[PDB]
Amino acid sequence: PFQQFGRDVSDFTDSVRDPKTSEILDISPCAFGGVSVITPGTNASSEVA
Amino acid sequence: IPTNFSISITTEVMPVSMAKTSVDCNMYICGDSTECANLLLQYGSFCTQ
Structure with missing residues (x-):
């Protein structure tokens, strides 16, 4: 009841109590990363994945 | 022996x-700041390396 915010080991907010009614949890991380390109060869064809 | x-x-x-x-x-x-990324891009392509 006395706790309002919540952080992680990296000091990033992982969950926080809802300020208004219906107090539930909060943000989870989204999708990210480095897109890789798979090419079978320019001389072979032009398709790519 | x-x-x-x-x-x-x-x-x-x-x-x-x-x-x-x-x-x-x-x-x-x-992480998600736009001006932070704009300032980081000034330092060069360290992230790519």
């Missing part, structure tokens, strides 16, 4: 691989 034999078995642990880590510098530094 030896008169008998002794079939012994020894062990040897040798690493051949480590943890394949991948750190996205675009999320590690300047």
Whole structure:
């Protein structure tokens, strides 16, 4: 009841109590990363994945 | 001169691989701020390297 915010080991907010009614949890991380390109060869064809 | 034999078995642990880590510098530094990324792009292509 006395706790309002919540952080992680990296000091990033992982969950926080809802300020208004219906107090539930909060943000989870989204999708990210480095897109890789798979090419079978320019001389072979032009398709790519 | 030896008169008998002794079939012994020894062990040897040798690493051949480590943890394949991948750190996205675009999320590690300047997670979601736009001006932060604009300032980071001034320092050059360190993240690509």
